[PDB]
Amino acid sequence: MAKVQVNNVVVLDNPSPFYNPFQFEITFECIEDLSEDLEWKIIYVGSAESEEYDQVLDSVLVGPVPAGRHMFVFQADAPNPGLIPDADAVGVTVVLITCTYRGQEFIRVGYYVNNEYTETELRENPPVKPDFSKLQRNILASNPRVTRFHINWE
């Protein structure tokens, strides 16, 4: 059906400090030489309230993509705290990995991210202003939400 199929996503350096870059080791396979590059994005949801707080941590092209099975590490910078609503800073949100071909998204892998203080003192009494230097990010890598879209591969 679709020329590209994602075989697996391994979440590296997890858990880790909120400031560390996201590191995904992706494995996907191409059923037939693509004429263009694949475009991958890592999107962090600052708040579920509005998409207006989505942060595209990074956008990269992968290519060339000859038919076969392939693997690469998609690394991106940690979101900018200054753009994250205080109330959504500590707790759970989501981070998305999407892939698009010829301007059309065909796959999207969402993960829940849990940002908590490891320091029991702070966990008991969280500061009004979230302290991201002391936050730990735990990508819940066991339960990935995979959504596939039907696009025109030409």
Place this chain on the structure above:
Amino acid sequence: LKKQVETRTADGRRRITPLCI
């Protein structure tokens, strides 16, 4: 990996050339 090859597209975009399995 991270012996991974990345270049810039003709128009300055980041591009990773994947490893073949």
